[PDB]
Design an enzyme around this catalytic site. Structure first.
Site, PDB file in Angstrom:
ATOM      1  N   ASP A 116      70.314  51.980 -10.914  1.00 53.37           N
ATOM      2  CA  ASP A 116      71.484  52.065 -11.790  1.00 53.37           C
ATOM      3  C   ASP A 116      71.926  50.673 -12.228  1.00 53.37           C
ATOM      4  OD1 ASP A 116      73.780  52.684 -13.095  1.00 53.37           O
ATOM      5  OD2 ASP A 116      74.914  53.269 -11.296  1.00 53.37           O
ATOM      6  N   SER A 163      75.018  45.102 -29.847  1.00 55.46           N
ATOM      7  CA  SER A 163      74.073  45.582 -30.843  1.00 55.46           C
ATOM      8  C   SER A 163      74.536  45.178 -32.235  1.00 55.46           C
ATOM      9  CB  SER A 163      73.951  47.110 -30.734  1.00 55.46           C
ATOM     10  OG  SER A 163      73.177  47.657 -31.781  1.00 55.46           O
TER      11      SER A 163
END
EC number: 3.4.23.22
Length: 330
Positions: A35, A199
């Site tokens: 994770d 992004s």
């Protein structure tokens, strides 16, 4: 040193991926959920409340000659999905794919929430976010990667998650045969303890690319892609019959639909998520309403590039002094 381990979807939807991890001496192999959005290595154990264990493999520290109780140490974690677990702490030898760390904090669960009990395929979590998020008290502990870093050939790990197929976690090296083209690296902020990056934009299907900054985290422990409501609305508007259902808990669409791809920007590069990766199947067995793999982050507080996004890429987690992320197509 290096390590390399195969990671395998737990079910036919790729809801999560499990990777075998050797703990203790002799080794006890548990299948952990790696994770990158958390920083505790915790396991079902011989200490876990018996009614909360339902098919998981447990770690028994009393059977490990290298286990040592970390005196006074406790841990307690709550995840973004509302699940939780807590317990005490041992140090022991932990190996992943041939890479061994001695003295790793292994957090033994005394209690786990129902969602963990109900998932017999996940024996615990191995956190790969920054150690500042580790919950051990009163002395915070380091992640497996942080402990291994100095010994690794290069201070990196990579995630290569499969679509409906096994994939690979590598430590200490970048497998140049595992991706196409080049890897585009992008800056990381560690201020929240995550692999947080920005992004450069998105496109829906064959549509034009929208240049816009989307801050979010690369999180292998989250199944779906959670993005701003504007972006998600633009995606689902291209699927006839798709709608947000408050009763189901997100966007659903007719199972008869063909989904468009979704592209996200990494610098000047583009990662394309095929439409099929966004189909999470019937909301309940036999239903013709299917659950979408792109969902709004509006109620989360952060955008999350979970498995839906990451499995479309070869992803480099560069843990150099100034960390960065790399993405390549594959």
């Amino acid at each position: 040193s290096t390590g390399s381990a195969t990671t395998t979807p737990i079910d036919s939807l790729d809801d999560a991926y499990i990777t075998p991890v050797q703990i203790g001496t002799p080794a006890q192999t548990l299948n952990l959920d790696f994770d990158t959005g958390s920083s505790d290595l915790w396991v079902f154990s011989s200490e876990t409340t018996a009614s909360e264990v339902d098919g998981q493999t447990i770690y028994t520290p009393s059977k490990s000659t290298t286990a040592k109780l970390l005196s006074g140490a406790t841990w307690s974690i709550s995840y973004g999905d509302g699940s939780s677990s807590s317990g005490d702490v041992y140090t022991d030898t932990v190996s992943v794919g041939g890479l061994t760390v001695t003295g790793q904090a292994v957090e033994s669960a005394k209690k786990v929430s129902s969602s963990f009990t109900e998932d017999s395929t996940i024996d615990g979590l191995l956190g790969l976010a920054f150690s500042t998020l580790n919950t051990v008290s009163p002395t915070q502990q380091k992640t497996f990667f942080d402990n291994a870093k100095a010994s690794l050939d290069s201070p990196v790990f990579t995630a290569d998650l499969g679509y409906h197929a096994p994939g690979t976690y590598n430590f200490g090296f970048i497998d140049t045969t595992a991706y196409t083209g080049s890897i585009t690296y992008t800056a990381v902020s560690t201020k929240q303890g995550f692999w947080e990056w920005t992004s450069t934009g998105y496109a829906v299907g064959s549509g034009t690319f929208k240049s816009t900054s989307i801050d979010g985290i690369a999180d292998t422990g989250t199944t779906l892609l959670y993005l701003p409501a504007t972006v998600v609305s633009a995606y689902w508007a291209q699927v006839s019959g798709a709608k947000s259902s408050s009763s189901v808990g997100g966007y659903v669409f007719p199972c008869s639909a063909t989904l468009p791809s979704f592209t996200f920007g990494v610098g000047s590069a583009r990662i394309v998520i095929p439409g099929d990766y966004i189909d999470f199947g019937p909301i309940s067995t036999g239903s013709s309403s299917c659950f979408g793999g792109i969902q709004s982050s509006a109620g989360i507080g952060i955008n999350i590039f979970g498995d839906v996004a990451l499995k479309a890429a070869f992803v480099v987690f560069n843990g150099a002094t100034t960390p960065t992320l790399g993405f390549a197509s594959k």
